[PDB]
């Protein structure tokens, strides 16, 4: 009985760990995309303010 | 042997569940901030285009 319980727990542990690792990898990719979005936002903001100042002059 | 295996399996399942929930939260917040940043980027690009045209005029 204990052997059966241990094997079932082992299988559940392995599958849940695999799914967690894959979702973690995708989360890392999402963070990379967020960083790129941050950079694009900052660059565009600088563009806009510079152009507005030049237009005023 | 079975007792020790069961204890280790329980601890591993606990830690994997905690890490999985952490990953889900990170994925959610990453997606939210990503969408907000993309919308801000769209707004900035539109503003840049409009002010550039006015500047040429």
Calpha distance A41→B32 (Å, rounded): 15
Please give the Cα distance from A10 to A2 (Å, whole number): 12
The CA-based angle B7-B12-B18, given to 5 degrees, is: 130
**Contact criterion met (CB below 8 Å) for A16 and B13:** yes
Residues of B whose CB is below 8 A from A27: 23, 26-27, 30
Torsion sign, CA atoms A10, A13, A19, A20: negative
Confirm if A48 and B47 have CB atoms less than 8 A apart.
yes
Verify whether the Cβ–Cβ distance A24 to B23 is below 8 Å: yes
Which secondary-structure segment (H or E) carries B25? helix B2-56
Closest among B9, B53, B16 to A51, alpha carbons compared? B53
Element (H, E) at A8: helix A2-56
Token pair 């399942």: residue:
B13
Residue showing tokens 């052997």: A3
- Expt. technique: cryo-EM
């Amino acid at each position: 009985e204990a052997e059966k319980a241990a094997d079932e727990s082992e299988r559940g542990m392995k599958v849940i760990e695999s799914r967690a690792q894959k979702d973690e990898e995708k989360m890392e990719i999402q963070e990379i995309q967020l960083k790129e979005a941050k950079h694009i936002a900052e660059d565009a903001d600088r563009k806009y303010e510079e152009v507005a100042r030049k237009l005023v002059i």
